Every structure is written in C-alpha cells, then in structure tokens.
Design a protein around this ligand. Structure first.
Ligand SMILES: CC#CC[C@@](O)(c1ccc(N2CCN(S(=O)(=O)c3ccc(N)nc3)C[C@@H]2C#CC)cc1)C(F)(F)F
Ligand SMILES: O=P(O)(O)OC[C@@H](O)[C@@H](O)[C@H](O)[C@@H](O)CO
Length: 585
C-alpha cells in the first residue's frame, strides 16, 4: 500500500509493559537509547546534571562484564587499534603517494578536522610532509556551521573523497559515524572497498555492527549495516577495519556530539599518537603503549569532573543569562577557542537555539582590538562571558579583554589549564575570584608540541562546555525526560528519531504516529498517496522549515484531534513545554 516501501522497516509500537518482551528495546541502537541514569534529567538541578553527565561520560571507560557488547578496554578493540596503528605506520614509512583521511558528518566531521590538524602539526614539528586531511559533510564551511542536512548523500561523501584522493597511491580512510548511520560515510567506505589496492577503510563509531543503521539511503543501494558487515568480513584479511566499542547511551538521547565526539577523540588520538611515537622508536605499537594513553585520558575525566561544583555554578549563570534574554560568549585561544565555537554552533540544532545564544570566539575568529571594538559594545548586565586558555597562552592579551568586559558584564567565570606550579599573574587576578584552574600532573612527553598535553586539554574543555551548554538548556525546561522532543527535522536520522519519540510518548500505533507526523509536516495539504509514498527527503525539506512540528503531531495524537484543532490548542497554552507536559498527564 502507499507508504509501505518507506516505513516497512520501522518497528511497531509495543503494547504497554511489553516494550522489552516485544524485542523492541534490543533493536534501538545504543546511540539512540535512553540512558537510565538520566531518566529525570529534567528535574535534576545544576549540581545533579553535572553529576549525571559526568557519570554518563565515565561510561566511555567502563570495562566489559561477563554475554555483552565489546567496550573500549576489551581485547578485540585494543587488538584492532593496534592493527590499525600498524597500517598507519606503512603509510608513514612511505609519504610519497600516501594520505590519511578523517571523515564525518556533523560533530564527527568536526572531530575529524581538529585531529587532522594536531597530527599535521606533529609532522610539522618533525619537518615531515603532512599526510592527514579531513572531509566533512557539506565541505569545509561545515566545520563551524550548523548544517544537519548535508550528511544524507552517499554520492556527496564519495565525491569529496574522490577529490582529496587526487593521484595518491595509498589512502587510509577513517569514516566516523557514531551511529554507524551517516550516508556520507557509508558511501566512502563502500567505495574504498571496491579498490583495496589503493584504499583502506576504517569505520569508527559506537554501536555494534548489528545495530548499524539499516534503512535505505536515497542515493545508494546498500545500507550502512551491509557496508559495515562486509568490512567486518574484510578485517580477517586486514584490508578493512571496524572500531566499534560501546560507550553506553548519551545523557541526552541521540546527542552524539557529547559522549560520541569525546570517544571519537579518545579512541583516535590514542591510536594515531601510538602509531607515530612508535615508528621512530623502531618498535611496533603494543597494547601497552595504547593503554598508557587511554589511562591518561581516563585520568582526565577525574581531573575534569573534580571541579564539578564550579562547573555547576558556571552552568547556573549561563542558564540565567538565557532565562532572561541575554547572550553567552565563549572566548578561547588556539584550539580551545575552536572547540568553544563548535560547542556554540552545535547548540543551534540541538536546542533550537539562535546563533547568538551561545556563541564562540577564537583569538567566529576575531582578533584582539577587533573583538574589543566589534563585539564589546553589545554586552550587558545580564550576559555571561567565558574565557578559555592555558597559562602557556599569552595572558597580556587575555587580561586586556577581561578588564574591558568586567566593566560591562560582571558575570564572568573562566577555564584555565596549567601544569602543576604554574602561577596566575596579577595576584589580584580576581577578576576571577572563583576560577576553574585545571592543573595537569607533569607527564613525560617526548614530542616538541607536547601533543598528549594538548588532547587532555581539548577533551577536558569539551566535557565542560558540553555539560555547561547542554545543562543550561535542560534547566530551562526544553528537554523532556531525557529527550529533546521539539527538534528540527533537518535530515533523515532526525525524522526517524521524531517518529520514534512519537511512538514512545504516545504508545499509539506506527501507522497512526506516521500519519500524525506527516500531517503536521505538510499541513495545510492533506495526506495524498504522493505524500505517503514520498522519499524521506521530501518530508525533511518541508519540516526543516517549520516550528513545533513534533509537539503538534504528538498533541494531535493524544487529544485524538485534527492538526487544526491541536495548533489552536498549542496557541492557547502558555508554552509548548507546558502544553505538551499536561497533554501527557
Ligand atoms: C521517549 C522515546 C523515544 C525514542 C526512542 O524510542 C528511540 C529513539 C531513536 C530511535 N531511532 C532513531 C534513528 N533511527 S535510524 O533509522 O535513523 C538509525 C540511526 C542509527 C542507527 N545505528 N540505526 C538506525 C533508528 C531508531 C528508530 C526509529 C523509528 C528509536 C527509538 C528511545 F526512547 F528509545 F530513545
Ligand atoms: O556521527 P553520526 O552518528 O554519524 O552523526 C553525525 C551528526 O548527525 C551529529 O554529529 C549531529 O550533527 C550532532 O548534533 C549530534 O548531536
């Protein structure tokens, strides 16, 4: 019947109470699952939120128990990390013809970029030709932009790969889809597999290959699962690899920017750092070299979250600036400024936030006087400004910018990374009464940029800003339990997520839930057969443009009413948050 070809794969809503017995719950991929720790994230205060998220983040480093999915510290994963590090060596031994590509949509593409730089630096510091590069869904503009819709084309991702692989002779291609979901990556890997002689695909993400996304891709004949299964087969001959540890669900469901992006870094820096540091030591990568790194990264979670009360306080002050109607500025030097940007831009699609709400700045990329003249005028009593830097930075430039802002804001806090017994100039650097100095044990680095110290710092920053920003908005009511209900459908994965939220919250049938969603999207056109049968892209292009689509569809379903009736019900409640919450009673 009209539709069956597009919604056939969607599991039926289970009957109340049998959500697990139905077998439904075991097919929700980990990345999309509801984390049990965050059942009530919408009733945690800023102190509980930092706890529960900091807890969630810890699950990256949990070990495998006794019938269970492989995790990061399991032997099959470390073994794969070694073999891959291995394959990165063959390419470092042969830079003429060689390339290494790090590719992802969204935050996976963001993490890819950062790492491609760091390891380019590492080879610059050694006077080696840089071999890393990156590919992001939507081209390089995508790095610092919200562009959710660009990940849905396999041919796109393939074209980008054909470009950058020029007339190279040996190309390692690392595809990063946290969900083993994004068509961008799917094509790249599948294509890699058609020319083994040149290419080596390494798929990275955080679901088992049996939860790999399996719906049809519009411009491609195989699904991610098929492509992933076939790579897993090629691993036995070392011509492809899948690195897919489980790290547990996200604190905010399907927010793979967070634990997924963290784990992407932890997992990839480790592996690559290991492969570098060990080539010119004349030695093969061992698990022992890897674990040195992972344990350092593990220490960093504990280092980072031991400043939780302060993290909670900064969040409170970001939540209030927004609760009024003011803005937040994340001000950062070097890489930690980029991460600031990427946290800000990510807030847009993740929260229906506007590009000023939580903005990032690198010294997007404005200079010292430049930022003084341009942005400094626009500030206000109620804002918040956050300063992000190490003591190795250049604090003459830093003190300047804060002194000027103190006048006009007085809601400033700060994030400062330091080796033990570095000291903060200006004994009256108060300024920041209650800093977040984060103080790093001296480690034994041999590389001239101290790249391992870099990653500790980047990650620690990412955890803070993720938790800050993500937390701020929870406090403001916009999260439902641990789901963002009212998201903007801007690619196919988000469309399915919306639909899955409808089935869960309403408990009503798959057909009914699809019908309500499609009506809410295309209102005032009614459901024709053309519409029912249309590719998910068509829905997305129309929904992406609209507001409250999901909450309207859910209301229609609960009240049993028309779209017309529920639009007027929405406009007759004080807020979307309150309408939805009480319809659920
Ligand atoms: C409240 C509620 C809810 C949503 C939820 O029921 C849920 C959330 C997301 C999903 N997804 C959303 C994403 N789809 S997917 O096809 O895009 C996909 C993505 C990645 C992947 N590895 N496999 C499939 C897969 C799956 C579905 C559906 C419909 C399913 C259920 C759960 F609670 F489990 F979080
Ligand atoms: O890395 P994945 O699973 O392929 O997802 C890629 C992107 O959808 C993802 O990065 C998204 O943009 C972020 O908002 C996640 O919160």
């Amino acid at each position: 019947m009209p539709g069956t070809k597009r919604f056939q794969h969607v599991i039926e809503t289970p009957e109340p109470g049998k959500w697990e017995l139905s077998g439904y719950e075991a097919a929700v991929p980990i990345t999309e699952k509801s984390n049990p720790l965050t059942q009530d994230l919408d009733k945690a205060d800023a102190e509980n939120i930092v706890r529960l998220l900091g807890q969630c983040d810890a699950e990256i480093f949990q070990e495998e128990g006794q019938s269970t999915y492989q995790r990061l510290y399991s032997e099959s994963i470390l073994t794969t990390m070694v073999q891959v590090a291995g394959k990165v060596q063959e390419v470092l031994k042969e830079p003429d013809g060689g390339l290494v590509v790090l590719s992802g949509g969204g935050t996976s593409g963001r993490m890819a970029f950062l790492m491609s730089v760091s390891f380019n630096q590492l080879m610059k510091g050694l006077g080696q030709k840089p071999l890393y590069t990156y590919l992001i869904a939507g081209g390089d503009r995508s790095v610092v932009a919200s562009r959710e819709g660009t990940e849905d084309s396999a041919l796109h991702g393939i074209e980008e790969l054909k470009k950058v692989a020029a007339g190279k002779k040996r190309v390692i291609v690392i595809g990063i889809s946290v969900g083993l979901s994004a068509p961008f990556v799917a094509g790249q890997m599948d294509c890699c597999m058609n020319n083994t002689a040149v290419f080596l695909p390494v798929l990275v993400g955080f679901n088992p290959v049996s939860m790999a996304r399996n719906d049809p891709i519009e411009d491609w004949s195989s699904t991610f699962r098929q492509v992933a299964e076939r790579m897993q087969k090629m691993q036995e001959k070392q011509k492809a690899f899948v690195l897919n540890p489980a790290i547990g669900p996200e604190g905010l469901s399907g927010s793979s920017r967070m634990k997924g992006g963290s784990a992407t870094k932890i997992l990839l820096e480790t592996l690559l750092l290991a492969a570098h540091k060990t080539v010119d030591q004349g030695i093969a990568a061992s698990q022992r070299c890897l674990l040195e790194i992972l344990r350092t990264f593990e220490r960093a979670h504990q280092v980072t979250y031991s400043q939780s009360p302060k993290i909670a306080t900064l969040m409170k002050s970001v939540s209030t600036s927004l609760e009024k109607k003011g803005h937040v500025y994340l001000v950062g030097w070097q890489t930690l400024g980029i991460i600031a940007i990427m946290d800000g831009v990510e807030c847009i699609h993740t929260f229906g936030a506007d590009f000023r709400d939580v903005r990032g700045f690198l010294i997007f990329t404005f200079s010292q006087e430049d930022f003084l003249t341009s942005i400094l005028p626009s500030l206000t009593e109620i804002d918040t400004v956050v300063f992000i830097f190490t003591l190795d930075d250049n604090l003459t430039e830093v003190q300047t910018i804060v002194e000027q802002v103190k006048e006009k804001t007085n809601h400033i806090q700060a994030l400062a990374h330091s080796t033990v017994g570095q000291t903060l100039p200006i004994p009256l650097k108060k300024l920041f009464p209650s800093i977040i100095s984060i103080t790093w044990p001296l480690l034994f680095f041999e590389y001239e940029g101290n790249f391992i110290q870099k990653f500790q710092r980047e990650l620690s920053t990412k955890w803070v800003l993720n938790t800050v920003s993500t937390g701020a908005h929870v406090l403001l009511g916009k999260i439902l339990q641990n789901h963002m209900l009212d998201l903007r459908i801007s690619n196919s994965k988000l469309f399915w997520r919306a639909l899955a939220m409808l089935q869960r919250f309403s408990g009503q049938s798959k057909a009914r839930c699809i019908e309500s969603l499609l009506r809410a999207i295309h209102f005032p056109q009614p459901l024709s057969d053309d519409i029912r049968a249309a590719p998910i892209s068509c829905h997305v292009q129309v929904a992406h443009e609209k507001e409250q689509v999901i909450p309207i569809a859910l209301l229609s379903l609960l009240f049993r009413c028309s779209i017309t009736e529920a639009q007027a019900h929405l406009a007759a409640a004080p807020s979307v948050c309150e309408a939805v919450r009480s319809a659920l009673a």
